Structures are given as structure tokens and as C-alpha cells.
């Protein structure tokens, strides 16, 4: 129901944005609970110390996971934005949920009277048990617009000062009418705001402050304004206002069950996933978390350098875009001509702006001296990680019109180039981890009029097979037809890149991928 | 990245007379109009058209995956 | 400076503010203009912006306000000074102290005045009605 790009900040993953809060052991071993913009569900997280709190000894790490998000947003909405003061009357929707409970705990501490809305009766009972201060006159129904009448009646027709709204459509408009003069409306939902629904401006004749609250801005920006909310949360933690919520714990292996439990909508409290079990020691100073079986996918170090022979060419530019997304921050692209089109300049400028240390080269991998020069440039940038050979020089034609010169021309980039790259990499590349060369189904199946191209592709496979039997990395991917950049339909670049992601992990030497027509 | 479709436009102005005035023929027989996009001002102007306050929202991929 | 001025009767202050601010907008808007001008002014706000509304016409007419502006953190205020007289004296003392401090610090300077004698109060009303006065 939510598009990944809606989350503020540029992630490019299209996934892994799940999770916002966690509780675990700092690198040293202290018990901490943090607040990450995204990527909270994981066996580890990389977060700045400004977003980490210290778990008091009275708490267990299971409890810690419920405090950060709800209490940070509650404090930000009330104390920082609404400037709630003691004795005021405020309305909090969905009191059973975490945000509502944090708002109630903050409000009752100041001495404010509270009106709340709860969908079912058991939620009313639970809230009555949690906060004995509330009476039978402090409740209403969140599933209809009847709470307007309740709040207007019990407040003497005046209304309420603050209203923390999480509802939508007609229920938002109803909550607007409950405001009293000099009221403040704190909006934390995102449906009506996203849809640009209208709000009658006649409510502002009454001195009113309509607040748009989004805690996401703090995670990626506005660091200075964050320390205020951090201090408020810490003071609440020490002063007993911040009490951990109820926690329904699911194991790590049953995460889909946890998501289904959340989806059903029956939970009261905070759903927590137990990635790992807490130990009695107050400071474990452990080395690593326990290992688990997880799908394997490709990533690259930041200090490694990668090379794409024939990179400027269109299959090469999509492969590079894929690589930059997987962490490659220094690159080397080879091409005889150099940047000679608007598209290539656009892409390279964008990558340089992103921080990638791109460098276009003209060294020809055909000549062994050229291969040494290319590897030397990559070494100058950094230790060599991989070598992708995508160079190709087609000279098609039936065997009758083929000649030695055309065969030599086709073979120089692919066969000779791969040989020279292999030799130089063996000599002077210890840290190398990938070595890929691209072939065509014209090699396996065979095609008419491409005998030279087929021969050139086949020889590359042999070098890769030899490399793998010797223990060094190697791989040859035989493609069909690439779409965006035989009797087989063109394959889209998205599918091709996904498949290449799959192939780099398997143990086989030569692989293939093509789509059958009809 | 991904595909974004229009969902709201604040204001659009069209004027065929100025549009006819703006179009300039290319060296070949084709007729061309020069466009500008100012993201700071949120205006896309070309010939006799003026689009202001365009807002686009990401659309989920159909995931037809017709290619397997 | 000369880049701090724009045009009020026309709606050309949107391009000016956006251009000279780098497209970010502004942190605070004190608005006393009409419907189209008001809608143009809201679009000038930056993130975390604040829109102080001292007019009456749009509020009285109950004209609509697109809530998408609130997706960006924003604070929309309806500023009616008259509430201080009917109640909220404790709140009023804050404004009193602020104005007194401004007077005793030099921040508050007296505006220009066009004096009309008592017997010509009708002339004063007419002159203000013409709308050509400064001060
Ligand atoms: N502005 C911002 O940036 C932030 C926004 N929020 C908002 O705060 C609200 C509460 O968030 P959170 O702390 O997770 O609280 P919960 O998700 O626990 O609260 C959900 C509440 O919504 C109602 N509800 C009804 N059906 C469902 C269902 N199927 N699934 C979930 N809820 C259901 C219930 O209240 P009832 O029965 O009374 O209707 C329930 O208690 C959300 O609207 C969230 O978007 C939170 C923090 C930051
Ligand atoms: N995309 C496809 O349809 C399929 C292609 N393949 C193989 O997969 C890869 C995909 O690339 P592809 O889309 O064909 O790219 P192109 O054929 O569009 O371009 C090939 C690239 O190699 C460069 N190149 C050619 N000769 C040399 C040389 N001697 N030294 C350095 N660079 C050189 C070219 O630049 P310049 O000309 O300036 O040197 C260009 O950048 C290739 O290896 C191709 O053979 C196989 C199956 C499917």
C-alpha cells in the first residue's frame, strides 16, 4: 500500500526499508535502543550515536524496543510542537496504539485531562487498567464520528486544546470541530495530507495552530533540532514517565507470522521480533552475533576498485549503474573512442556527483602492455576487486565473405583481451574477487553468419573454466538478446540484471540466460 | 527511478495565438518548439503552454513478469 | 537590499521569492492579502515553514486549503490579536513585555504620521479610504 520512494531520502533499494527501532548491544557491549530511518530489521544496524539511548537496568531489551519511536513522536508532537501546558484538555485518537499510549503517559504526567478513542471494548478495559486516572467519561469510539458529540458535551461545548489526530476522511473533519479557541491541531497521519484534501479555513478565526508533524525529517535532516527531543526522552526515561508498552514477541524465523499478526489488526501494544536472545551479562563484549541462513546477494567493498572493459557501451553502462548501487565507489571504464554521446556524459557526471570516483580510460586490453596499464590505473585508484570483460567488435557475414582480417578484428577484444586480462590478474591482483566475461547463445546454440563471433565467445569460456579449476575466480555468462540497450525474444535489462545477481553466487563456471519466443 | 504518473497540476494556461507565433520551422520541413523546465519555479513552458505545480506520484510496477 | 522587494498587487512575488531563495522558500510568511495572493503565498513556504495569517477575508469566507502543504512539516497560524482583550491577560503580559523591551532597546521606532485635526475627522476617513497613505 506504500511505495518505497515515499520514505524520505534516496535509498534506491526498493526494499530493506522495513523496521525503524531496535534494541541491542553496542559495539562495546552497552545495552542501547536506537532509531534508524530505515533498515531496522537486521542482525546489525549502522546508526549515529545521536540516535542511541541507554537502556536503564530496570528494563529488559524486549521492553526497550517499544519506547523509541512512539515516545519520540509523542514528545515531539506535544512538548515541542503543541507546547502542551499543565491543566489543558486534549484528545488523543487510537489510545490503544503506541503513539496514543505515549501521548497519554506524557499528558497524565503534566496533569492534563484526556479524552481517548478506542475501537473495541477490550482496548477500553486495557487502557483503564494501565492508567487508573482515566474515568468512564474519558472514552469514545474511534470507528465513527460520535466522539465529537461526546467531547463537545463533556467539555461544556468549549472543546479541547490539543488534538493528536491519526484518523482520516470524515473523522479528520470531525476532529477539527472539537477544537477550542487557542487550540492546536497535531496531525500525524498521512492520508488526507497525501491526497491534498481541502480544509475549511474558517476554523482559524478561532486562534488555531494547525500542525503538520512528520518525525521522518529529523532522521535525514534537522540534526540540531533533534537533540531537544532526545533530551526530552532521556528526562522521561529517568523520571519514570516513559514506561515500556506491552510486547508480543515473535521469533526471528517466524517474521511473516508477525507481519500477518500486525495485519489482522487485533494487537494491543507493540509487536516485536526477537532476532536474538538477551544474556544475563550486563556487558557481554561479544565478538559477533550468531549466524543465520539468509539468501545470498552481491555487494562490494568501498575501498575496492572495479573495471568494466567496454564500459562506455550501453550494456556496460547499465552494469555499472547496477554496480554503483551495490557499493562500488571507484570504477574504471575502457573504450577506444572515449565519451562521445550525451547519454554517457550524463551518466558519468551523475555518478561523479554521487561521489563515485569514475575514470574513463583508453588502454586497449588487446595488447598485454595495455592490460598492465589498465590494471595499474585501477591499482592507483585502489586494490582491484573485479574485471568485467564486455568488449565486442562485430563483423558479421556468412563464411563465404569472411576473411582472416575480420576474424582477427573480432577476436582481439574478446579472446586476446580475456587472455591478457587473465595473465595480468594472475600476476598482479591478489585481492581480486570477481572475474566475469559476457558471451552469447550464438556460442552454445550456434547462429548463421556469426561464425567469427561464436568462435570468439567460445574461447572465453575455456579461459574461465581453466581459472575456476585453478581456484581463482571466473565466470562466463551466455546471454540471448538484450532488450533496452536464434529465435529468442529480447530480454529486458531488469530481468538480465536480476539474473546476473543470481549467477555471481552459483558455483558453476559457464551459465546462460535467454527467453523463448512464444 | 521507477515510473511516475501525473496526479495533480496546479494551473495550466494555453494560448493558440502565442503558440502559432512561437513555433519556428527547422531546416527540414518539421516544425519545432523550444521548451524550458525550471524546477526552482515549478513551471514547464513550451510555445503557448504553461504548466505550473505539477505533482507526480510513483506507481507500483505491474509485476506482470511476462518474461520468465 | 534591492533584491528584497517584489510586487504585491500582482501574483509575481512567487517567482521572485523562489528564485532568490534557491528554490527552498522561506521560514515565515506574514500574509494580509486576498484569495489568489494567499494561495500563491502558501507555496512560498520552505520545510518547517510557518504561515502567520493576519487577514480576515479568506478565513471568513471559509475558502479551502489544500492539506498537502502539511506533508512538508508546516505550522499554519490564525493570528487574531483581539482575543487578548476578551480573555488571556496572562498571555497578554508576554506581548506587553515584548513591546516594552522593544521600546527600551531601540527596536521599536514610531511610524510616519499624517495629522488631521479633530474637526476634520471626516477628511481623515476619506484620506485613508483613498489608500494613498504611507504610515
Ligand atoms: N507523523 C508521523 O510521522 C508519525 C506517525 N505515526 C502515526 O501514529 C499512529 C499510531 O502508530 P503506532 O505507534 O504504530 O500505533 P498502532 O499501530 O499500535 O496503532 C494502530 C491503531 O489503529 C487502529 N487500527 C484499527 N485497525 C487496525 C489495523 N488493522 N492495524 C493497525 N491499527 C489498526 C487501532 O486504534 P482504534 O481501534 O482506536 O481505531 C489501533 O490501536 C499511526 O497512524 C502512525 O502512522 C507514528 C509515529 C510517527
Ligand atoms: N547486448 C547483447 O545483445 C548481448 C551482448 N553480448 C556480449 O555482452 C556484452 C554486452 O555489450 P554490448 O551490449 O554488446 O555492447 P556494444 O556492442 O554496444 O559495445 C561494446 C563496447 O565495447 C567497447 N569496445 C569494443 N572494442 C573495444 C576494444 N578493442 N577495446 C576497448 N573497448 C572496446 C565499445 O566501445 P568502443 O567501440 O569505443 O571501443 C563499447 O563500449 C558484450 O561483451 C557482448 O559481446 C552477448 C550476448 C548478448
Coordinates of N, CA and C in Angstrom, one line a residue, chain A residues 8-9 76 81 211-223 225, chain B residues 42, chain C residues 17-18 21-29 41-51 68-76:
Chain A
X8 N 11.3 9.4 3.0 CA 12.2 10.5 2.6 C 13.6 10.0 2.6
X9 N 14.4 10.6 1.7 CA 15.8 10.1 1.5 C 15.9 9.2 0.3
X76 N 7.7 14.9 20.5 CA 7.9 15.9 19.5 C 6.5 16.6 19.2
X81 N 6.1 20.7 19.6 CA 5.2 21.4 18.7 C 4.0 22.0 19.4
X211 N -0.9 21.9 12.9 CA 0.4 21.4 12.9 C 0.5 20.2 12.0
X212 N 1.5 20.2 11.0 CA 1.8 19.1 10.3 C 3.1 18.4 10.9
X213 N 2.9 17.3 11.5 CA 4.0 16.6 12.2 C 4.5 15.4 11.4
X214 N 5.8 15.4 11.1 CA 6.4 14.2 10.4 C 7.8 14.1 11.0
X215 N 8.0 13.0 11.8 CA 9.2 12.8 12.5 C 10.3 12.4 11.5
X216 N 10.0 12.0 10.3 CA 11.0 11.5 9.4 C 12.0 12.6 9.0
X217 N 11.6 13.8 9.0 CA 12.5 14.9 8.7 C 13.8 14.9 9.6
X218 N 13.6 14.5 10.8 CA 14.7 14.5 11.8 C 15.8 13.5 11.4
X219 N 15.4 12.3 10.9 CA 16.3 11.2 10.7 C 17.3 11.6 9.6
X220 N 16.9 12.2 8.5 CA 17.8 12.5 7.4 C 18.2 14.0 7.4
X221 N 17.6 14.8 8.2 CA 18.0 16.3 8.3 C 17.6 16.8 9.6
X222 N 17.9 18.1 9.8 CA 17.5 18.8 11.1 C 18.1 18.1 12.3
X223 N 19.4 17.8 12.3 CA 20.0 17.2 13.4 C 20.0 18.0 14.6
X225 N 17.8 20.3 15.7 CA 16.5 20.3 16.4 C 16.2 18.9 17.0
Chain B
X42 N 9.0 25.7 -10.6 CA 7.9 24.7 -10.9 C 7.0 25.1 -12.1
Chain C
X17 N 10.5 35.2 -4.9 CA 10.9 34.6 -3.6 C 11.6 33.2 -3.9
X18 N 11.0 32.4 -4.8 CA 11.6 31.1 -5.1 C 12.9 31.2 -5.7
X21 N 15.7 32.6 -3.3 CA 15.9 31.7 -2.1 C 16.5 30.4 -2.6
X22 N 16.8 30.2 -3.8 CA 17.4 28.9 -4.3 C 16.3 27.8 -4.4
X23 N 15.1 28.2 -4.5 CA 14.0 27.2 -4.5 C 13.6 26.6 -3.2
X24 N 14.3 27.0 -2.1 CA 14.0 26.4 -0.8 C 12.7 27.0 -0.3
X25 N 12.5 28.3 -0.5 CA 11.4 29.0 0.1 C 11.8 29.9 1.2
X26 N 10.9 30.1 2.2 CA 11.1 30.9 3.3 C 10.6 30.2 4.6
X27 N 11.1 30.7 5.7 CA 10.7 30.1 7.0 C 9.5 30.7 7.6
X28 N 9.0 31.9 7.2 CA 7.9 32.6 7.8 C 7.3 33.5 6.8
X29 N 5.9 33.5 6.8 CA 5.2 34.3 5.9 C 4.1 35.0 6.7
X41 N 1.0 32.6 -1.8 CA 1.9 32.8 -0.7 C 2.3 31.5 0.0
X42 N 1.3 30.6 0.1 CA 1.5 29.3 0.8 C 2.6 28.5 0.1
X43 N 2.6 28.6 -1.2 CA 3.6 27.8 -2.0 C 5.0 28.3 -1.8
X44 N 5.2 29.5 -1.2 CA 6.5 30.1 -1.0 C 7.2 29.5 0.3
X45 N 6.4 28.8 1.1 CA 7.0 28.3 2.3 C 8.0 27.2 2.1
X46 N 9.0 27.1 2.9 CA 10.0 26.1 2.9 C 9.7 25.0 3.9
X47 N 10.5 24.0 4.0 CA 10.3 23.0 5.0 C 10.3 23.6 6.4
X48 N 9.5 23.1 7.3 CA 9.4 23.6 8.6 C 8.9 25.1 8.6
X49 N 8.3 25.5 7.5 CA 7.8 26.9 7.4 C 6.6 27.2 8.3
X50 N 6.3 28.4 8.4 CA 5.2 28.9 9.3 C 4.5 30.0 8.6
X51 N 3.1 30.0 8.6 CA 2.3 30.8 7.8 C 1.4 31.6 8.7
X68 N -1.9 19.2 1.4 CA -0.6 18.6 1.0 C 0.5 19.4 1.5
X69 N 0.3 20.7 1.7 CA 1.4 21.6 2.2 C 1.9 21.1 3.6
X70 N 1.1 20.4 4.3 CA 1.4 19.9 5.7 C 2.2 18.6 5.6
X71 N 2.3 18.0 4.4 CA 3.1 16.8 4.3 C 4.5 17.3 4.5
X72 N 4.9 18.4 4.0 CA 6.2 19.1 4.4 C 5.8 19.6 5.8
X73 N 6.8 19.5 6.8 CA 6.4 20.0 8.2 C 6.0 21.4 8.0
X74 N 4.9 21.9 8.5 CA 4.4 23.3 8.4 C 3.6 23.6 9.6
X75 N 3.5 24.9 9.9 CA 2.6 25.4 11.1 C 1.8 26.5 10.6
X76 N 0.5 26.3 10.4 CA -0.5 27.3 9.9 C -1.2 27.9 11.1

